[PDB]
Structure 1
Amino acid sequence: SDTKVYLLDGGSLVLDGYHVFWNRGPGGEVRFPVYSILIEHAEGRFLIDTGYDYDHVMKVLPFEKPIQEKHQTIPGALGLLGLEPRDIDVVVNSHFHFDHCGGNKYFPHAKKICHRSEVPQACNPQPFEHLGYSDLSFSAEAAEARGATAQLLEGTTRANSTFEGIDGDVDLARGVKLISTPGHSIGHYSLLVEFPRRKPILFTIDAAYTQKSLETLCQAAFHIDPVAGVNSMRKVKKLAEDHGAELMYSHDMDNFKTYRTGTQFYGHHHHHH
């Protein structure tokens, strides 16, 4: 049971270049991918993030012009792998912006994990965080707090949408580490996956939308604390250098086109060793 990582292509959204590169831009529409990270591990199947819900975006953020085919929903992407939501044991959310938790609703059976601060933030966000924390279907508690119980999928209860809260740099499983990278959101996590026979991969998630972002220390305009945001970028750069990790970014179309998705995966076996 060697560690494998499968990227679940979740389609795309659009933001202004001023959203993507805070203050710098240039301005104008930029379309970027959204994906989730499925880890097939000895300890179980872990899904980090769950993309966006198409209907939610069309209702609440239609200016983000979602494109998402049937195979780019979470059930659809899992289907490419001959899996279904019930095959996933643990769901981890990097943060509860709508584009990272829109598929949580399909995983009532799963254990849920997130930073200790994130459910409380979803319940009572800053005034400027309402569009980010706009989809409360991942939490009956948060939906109730926000007056958004109408968003709840039938069958979602407090009992099946409670999160175990974590803090700091901690192990999710053997060789899978959650790296605290606050700034974009109060409890934002990045992800370091180690493999038995290859160098690690550091998924920046929303601590760095693109390669350019991390190079230039220019974060996204969506953030709660930009000082933290930069410090977290430095932390990520240093961690990658230390571990000799390969960096992969959350919302970077040019790089994403070069990433393995669908039935392609990271963590291959040897063939002559």
Structure 2
Amino acid sequence: QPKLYVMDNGRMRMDKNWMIAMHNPATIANPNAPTEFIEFPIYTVLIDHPEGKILFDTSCNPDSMGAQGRWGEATQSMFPWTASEECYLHNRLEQLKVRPEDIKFVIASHLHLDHAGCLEMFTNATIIVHEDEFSGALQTYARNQTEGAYIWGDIDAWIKNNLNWRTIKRDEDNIVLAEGIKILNFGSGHAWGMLGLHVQLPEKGGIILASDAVYSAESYGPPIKPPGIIYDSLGFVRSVEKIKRIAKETNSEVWFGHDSEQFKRFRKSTEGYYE
């Protein structure tokens, strides 16, 4: 019978406008309107399934921040990640007695700095990623982009560690990985190619892992509120509606990428698991 764990991988801050576009626009009464630097959780999900362990997302690399950090100086200043050692993914998995080598599948929802940071650890797993997300990230690496949401040094490590990539093709969807585990292909929106997961647990029922396809309950609405920069704005809205449709049709609970209030209410890996 499967078990699902939520692993707390620390906290990030950023301009609220990144999360909710134009959340507090300047007005005639408030012409120099101040923004807020909001804090939110970075997390990963491990499903201990009889057919093999599945990891959804990988958080940020431990070598991300600081003077030796792989993240560019501007990136560090705009999206600072705060994490104690116990929050690092390798330690969260050790606390669960799971070796990186024990992971059969890693699902990269996309290849942003806060989701693909530790792909390099999983050299025996099949790494599942949207083909267009893979292409886009690799182009950034080829252009030697040292700032932004695709981290040059993380990509460099994925290449050096010769990972076992499986790309989800842009027309593929509802990819069954194991009994009750299905990859949802949301396509372009937040990024070039977004993957989610539907998990059917015997007791808890249906769960949809949305990652950055839906940042928060405020994003989800209604009304739907898009993020402040967005690769494909039409695809973003289409993807949120797809998530709502699947949630309704399957009676599933939607887990957002970065909702503080929702995350606070989750049972974490240190206290237990879902079933």
Q: TM-score range by the shorter chain?
A: 0.7 to 0.9
TM-score normalized by the length of structure 2: 0.84
Q: Which moved more, 1:67-76 or 1:117-126?
A: 117-126
Structure 1: gaps (5+ residues)? 144-151, 268-273
**Out of 84, 96, 103, which is 1:88 matched to?**
103
Q: 1:79 to 1:184 in 2, by over 3 A?
A: same
Number of aligned residues? 251
Query: 1:148 corresponds to which residue?
Result: none
Distance in 1, matches of 2:229 and 2:164, equals 26
Q: Offset at 1:7?
A: 1.1
**Out of 76, 82, 95, which is 1:62 matched to?**
76
Letter in 2 for 1:198: K
Matches within 5 A, 1:184-199: 184-199=190-205
Matches within 5 A, 1:137-156: 137=154, 139=155, 143=156, 152=157, 156=160
Query: 1:173 corresponds to which residue?
Result: 178
Identical aligned pairs, as a percentage?
Answer: 27
Query: 1:41 corresponds to which residue?
Result: 49
Structure 2: gaps (5+ residues)? 26-34
Distance in 2, matches of 1:255 and 1:227, equals 26
Q: Offset at 1:118?
A: 1.7
Letter in 2 for 1:18: N
Distance in 2, matches of 1:253 and 1:265, equals 19
Q: 1:74 to 1:25 in 2, by over 3 A?
A: farther
- Indicate whether 1:10 and 2:9 are aligned: yes
For residues 233-260 of structure 1, what are the alpha-carbon distances to aligned partners after superposition, in whole Å with 9 as ceiling and x for unaligned? 0111111111110111111111111011
TM-score normalized by the length of structure 1: 0.85
- Indicate whether 1:245 and 2:252 are aligned: yes
Give the alignment's Cα RMSD to 1 decimal: 2.3
Structure 2 contact 140–152 (Cα < 8 Å) conserved:
no
Structure 2 contact 209–255 (Cα < 8 Å) conserved:
yes
Letter in 2 for 1:15: M
Runs of 4+ in 1 over 4 A off after TM superposition: 125-130
- Indicate whether 1:132 and 2:161 are aligned: no
For residues 47-104 of structure 1, what are the alpha-carbon distances to aligned partners after superposition, in whole Å with 9 as ceiling and x for unaligned? 1110012432443222122111111111111122122212212211010001001111
Q: Offset at 1:108?
A: 1.1
Query: 2:30 corresponds to which residue?
Result: none
Structure 1 contact 71–79 (Cα < 8 Å) conserved:
no
Query: 2:127 corresponds to which residue?
Result: 112
Query: 1:146 corresponds to which residue?
Result: none
Query: 2:36 corresponds to which residue?
Result: 28
